[PDB]
Each structure stands twice: as C-alpha cells, then as structure tokens.
Symmetry: C2
Amino acid sequence: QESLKHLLPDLSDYSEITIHLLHQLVLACGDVSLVNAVRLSQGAIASARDALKAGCPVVTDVPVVAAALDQTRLAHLGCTVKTLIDDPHITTAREAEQAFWHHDHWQQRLQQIPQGSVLAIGYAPSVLLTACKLIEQQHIQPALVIGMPIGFSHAPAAKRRLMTSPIPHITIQGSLGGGLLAAVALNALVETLI
Amino acid sequence: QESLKHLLPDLSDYSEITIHLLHQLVLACGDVSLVNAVRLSQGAIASARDALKAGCPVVTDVPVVAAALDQTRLAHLGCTVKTLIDDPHITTAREAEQAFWHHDHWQQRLQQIPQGSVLAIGYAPSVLLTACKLIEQQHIQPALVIGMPIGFSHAPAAKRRLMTSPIPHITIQGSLGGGLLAAVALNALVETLI
Ligand SMILES: [Cl-]
Ligand SMILES: [Cl-]
Ligand SMILES: [Cl-]
Ligand SMILES: [Cl-]
Ligand SMILES: [Cl-]
Ligand SMILES: [Cl-]
C-alpha cells in the first residue's frame, strides 16, 4: 500500500490512480482502515489499464457486484460483463457460499474465463480459492483479479493465497470484504482511464 | 449495544434477534467492530416487528438498498418497497450526495412517507438529516429508521442527530456505512419474523 509509493518516480500517475482507488473504497465503505489492508500487486494498475483499453471481458462472481460496475463506461470500452452465478439476492458471505454450493457447474463457468480478462470476486471465498488453484494449474490466465470477499473464521485462506500468485491482483488483506468493494475498485480503474 | 442485553429477562427473543442482526451485518461487511458501533433504540426490534407484521411501506434512499431487500419475503408480508430517487448507479457517499443534489423533489417524496412506515437510509447523510428534521417538526412519523450511511469528514451530524430522536432507530455510531448494511439489517428483522 504505502510501500507502493515506490510508484512516485514514474511518469505514470499510478500514484494518483492508487489514491483514487483507496479514496473510492473509503467513500464506499466508510472506514480508513482499508489503507493498511489494501494490497495491490506491482503492476496491478498497469495490467488493468492495458486490459481495459484492449476491451477485455469482465467476470464477477455474483450479480450484486456486476450490477455495481460502471456499466456504461465499460461498454464504451467494449468490455462484456458476466457473472459466475445468476442468483439475484446474494447479500452475505453465507448466502454467497451457499449459492455456490448449490450450483453444480459454476467451476466450468470459471474455467472458461477468456485469456487476459478481469476477474472480480466480491463475496465468496471459495470462488477466490478455486480461481487461485486454477491460475496455479495454468488453466486460466486473467489479466487481473480483484479479490475482495468477506473473510470469515476458519475460512479458505483465499486472500492470503491470492497475494502469493503470479497474476496481477488487488485484494484486501484481512476479513473485510463484500459490500460493493470489488466493483468500486474496478470502477475507480475505469474512470481514471475514460 | 452490549447494554441492550437488558433485553434478556423478557420472554421476547429480542435478544436472539439482536444477535442475529449483528451476525448478519458482520457476515456482510467483514469486521466485528460493528458490534460496538451498532446502536438500537430500546424497542427498535419490537417496533420493526410490529410494522412488518402489519404490512407497512418500506422506503429506501437509493435503488441499491431496495434491490438488496428480501423482496419476496417482504412482499408476502404485504410491504411495498419504494425509493426516494431512482438513479441506477449510486455506489459511494459522494455519488449518493450528488445524485440527491440533482433531484428537485425527493424532499416532497420523503415528506409523503406514509405513517408508520420503515425508513431505510444506506447511502445519503443529507437524506438522514432531512428525515430527522422532518421527524422533529412532526411532519413524518415512520415506525423505524435504519440510518446507516457513510459518515464523512466535516459531515452533517446525521447519525449523530438520529440518536437524539423520538422515533425508533437502528444506526451505526461512527463513519462506517454504505454497502448493503441497511438492507441487511432490515432483512435480519424480516427473517426472524417469517
Ligand atoms: Cl498508461
Ligand atoms: Cl449450475
Ligand atoms: Cl491445494
Ligand atoms: Cl412479537
Ligand atoms: Cl425529482
Ligand atoms: Cl437545524
């Protein structure tokens, strides 16, 4: 986070973009704690911008997250938005984990994530875990993974495993997650490019 | 708060309901801090359950909050759900406050809130301030106010002024807010009644 201010000698404005992202998160959720907790892989920002400019696919885990995307701006870039499951009313880590336990083939829908797309997981730790495993096995190659699910007690070490991965990622070290946080972050990346 | 356990010698089960509500909030947003911050007026629970059983109106501030309500369960109870503005993409304290600045007439729509309804504010502090003022002037009489918007720096003392109000309320002492928290609280009150 604050270490990421090695971004300062850069020509790039990845400094300013990172702060916009933190600012939007705080303006969404209401606590400054996120500044410590938010971890962005080096070249996360850069990977995002290159993917979006290219008009990549976006894949969210639940519909709440997709519905919070700046759908208009994204479509102007040519990005499609899809979700792993279509259950309307997911509003909780539990509701999410149960929704994904009752769906038989969402793992297949995840495997098909096209090369170099953005994967944004806001609710379910199991999805994030599976996405990590798939990435390590080199079955999916997304351009970026925003993993911000809720973190419960004696959970999948999902966010902890995400941080240690080859693929650019944005995540929240710790339990905090859910809400619209993943959509909020991706939105911040799409405003700073339009 | 923790004090709300004067509810224990009660026959009532408002104890268990209060804990379920906190459990749901924590499961939604991901931090336990909320248990301190969450404040329920005495008989908030009781007033909510009476209104919901009666098939009251539910009025949220933005569409995100309504869309996160347990729409079916609420509909079986006879509750209609409406919103003060119909702008699709509100996702941030800033986005909420400005959306409410471009609408001329949400003030009238709030004044018309029917007697004994539930008022649920998840995003805009200015709406919450207005509703307090209207309640004090005795121009609206809702059954309950879930005020859980974000609290920014140099803000209206919106959630601060709610605590000072005659009408039963559930609120978050502090800045934390937004997300789906207001919907999640009302949902907890609707499950415990079905
Ligand atoms: Cl660039
Ligand atoms: Cl399925
Ligand atoms: Cl393993
Ligand atoms: Cl009762
Ligand atoms: Cl209007
Ligand atoms: Cl005043």
